[PDB]
Amino acid sequence: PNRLIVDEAINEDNSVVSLSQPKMDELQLFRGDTVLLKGKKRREAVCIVLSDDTCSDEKIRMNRVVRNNLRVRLGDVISIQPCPDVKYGKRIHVLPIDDTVEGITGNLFEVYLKPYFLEAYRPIRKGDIFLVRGGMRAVEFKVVETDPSPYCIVAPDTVIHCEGEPIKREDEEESLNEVGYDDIGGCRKQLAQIKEMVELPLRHPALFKAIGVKPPRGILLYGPPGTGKTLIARAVANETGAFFFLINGPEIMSKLAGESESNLRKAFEEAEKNAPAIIFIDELDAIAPKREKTHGEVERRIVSQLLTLMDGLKQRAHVIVMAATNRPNSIDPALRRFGRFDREVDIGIPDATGRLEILQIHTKNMKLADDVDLEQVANETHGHVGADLAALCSEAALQAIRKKMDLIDLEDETIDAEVMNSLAVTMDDFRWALSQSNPSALRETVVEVPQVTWEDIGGLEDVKRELQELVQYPVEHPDKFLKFGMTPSKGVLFYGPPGCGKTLLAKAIANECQANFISIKGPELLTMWFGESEANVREIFDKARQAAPCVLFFDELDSIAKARGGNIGDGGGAADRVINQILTEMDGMSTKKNVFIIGATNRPDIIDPAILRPGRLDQLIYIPLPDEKSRVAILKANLRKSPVAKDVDLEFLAKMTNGFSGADLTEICQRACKLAIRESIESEIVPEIRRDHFEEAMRFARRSVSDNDIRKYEMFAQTLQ
């Protein structure tokens, strides 16, 4: 009884844990009460319990600081008990740990400990280790003396002493600046999926010895460089405690014949001796490239050696092998057969939210000025990966250090704590670093859950509802579909003029469903055909299966028909190699994988009719240019983020822009916004957009769809009845 599973916390605070209410009622404690935690080897901690809507009933959520003091790891279980007799302390003695007091001098108490405890009212226990962040350094301290014992709350009126040399870290505790899960920003879903696969085999090996189940013995990670593939592999080993062995392709390949095989075997033999252990092989495609793609005997031999060592993992107890590559299909397929590397996780590229999280992670210690806006940076850093965002944080820190501190300090390794704490990084330093950095992954496609909602789309009220019926109803009301023998559609095709919101329709339903949006463009379908790489069709559909829930959007479906001539071409049909592979993958995809396929085209008259057969994109939705009420709605939607003067007549503008698409109405709003901003900036050398700004914008905006194109689209839609 009163035993809870240790897991990660959302609240980063050094004295806070979170429980689900049913456990707070059974433990007879209230929100804000102090409790004691009992871990391993007679180690205890004191904390405050809060609650949220994310902790499960069986779990207790805590940060690394609490787990380190209890000598427990994620997946363990501890005891919890209330202690309502906790009172305030009188005098405490806190000293830093030498592991973090390097390159720094000055009054660490006044810089770190005093801000940390002042109005903080934190519960402490003798021997507690806690981390205080600031001045671009993270310093951890130990409680070595308390007048009350073993625990007390430190009030602002207590005496805090700090006299003596920094304390050497003990072997029973780990440094709080070591890499853990809280250092990983984006790809949180992937990290959770991996944790489930590896944490239990390593944390509780007894259960797999006794229970008739096979553990994963190999996980392949893939994505561009700098996304965190090697960060995850190390963070997992650090969190679980397994010995981490590092291997990389090019180093093993740099060895002579016989040396490369011996070195690879040694790593596996050492992992068994040090089990539980994790073997991470970086650049897997370099150590084990496809055999059919090389000529060398040594390269074919090292693949055979790795294949046998992977099979030997059925005998090497508690050893998991992980690997990283840039492309999941650039390695010899034998490694991915049952057993061996039977699991894989797509890391990809962080999205806008993950990029902000990474910037926040790499600023934990940084003092930021009020003008610093990392969300704006995350939105501007398109194509950047964690390696690039970390560079931006460090470069911005250096610029602030050179502007101020380099005119104060000597060219030495030791700086006063007060000087470091006095240094804050401004937005100009982040903008400078942004101009110096260059995205390492700008060409690769990025898949993310879109931020487009239904309120972002003007008009098309019936289409928005129709997509909800097509995408949500099959899983929200499955008993009605079964009752009436209905087969849910697997997708819908959109056709009509460009610039009417087709991209928002697919994103908006993905947003409400919290699903990833995968955007495939014509140039990708054209590359597959011309480059004789039709196998990339499977990569696209597999990305959807692995990214599920997701919406798989195939834009420019006409690109294949156009490649065959489009308007003229030969005497045959639109059938070709790429579309046949696409249709095959569609037929083999189940709706129970939470993947919905949406297509679009601006030339529906040349789409291979096969795509419209039952089981494919059988439903057709026409998206014409917005009507009178929709054009006004579009203008109003774009202006929701800015004050609009009372002299602006949006209905008059919409009546004039009769042939304009939604994309063209957006340009008018954005241009009028820019014009209002231009005036605002000059007034400081205004609070709202004036009629003059919209009328001026009207002089430059033009319709993107000609009158002849409108008739072509309307006649086609009419032909379909």
Binding site: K641, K674, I677, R678
Partner: protein, 41 residues
């Protein structure tokens, strides 16, 4: 008890202050004006 509730109030204030639009248009317009003045001189 009461000392624990004061500790909880302090922890809640720290977490909520740290964890808790026309501003991005204003920032982008000021940045564009500063770049235009830097190119005219």
């Amino acid at each position: 008890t009461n000392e624990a509730q004061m500790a909880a109030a302090a922890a809640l204030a720290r977490l909520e202050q740290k964890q808790s639009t026309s501003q991005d248009t204003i920032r982008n317009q000021v940045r564009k004006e500063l770049q235009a003045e830097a190119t005219v001189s």
